[PDB]
Amino acid sequence: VYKPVDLSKVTSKCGSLGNIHHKPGGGQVEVKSEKLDFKDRVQSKIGSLDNITHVPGGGNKKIETHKLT
């Protein structure tokens, strides 16, 4: 017989959340290339890529796992 119990609280209060500024790549990015030789695959990313601003009002997280085997 298997009867685990959770009554827990995962809680957050905030008076205000804000004035959050994320300014990636506000300057110069400058790439110069001459007489290059590539015999195999090239993957290139230049500039302001994949940046994240994540401002959840709570962002609280529960992870729970159970296994019988």
Residues that bind a copy of itself (CB under 8 A): 1-69
Sequence-ordered list of residues with C-beta below 8 angstroms from that of 19, at least 6 positions apart, any chain: none
Sequence-ordered list of residues with C-beta below 8 angstroms from that of 62, at least 6 positions apart, any chain: 10
3-state secondary structure of 58: coil
In the complex, minimum distance from the CB of residue 37 to a copy of itself, in angstroms, rounded to a whole number: 5
The least CB distance from residue 54 to a copy of itself, in Å, is: 5
Report the nearest approach of a copy of itself to the CB of residue 21 (Å). 5
Indicate the residue type of 31.
Answer: V
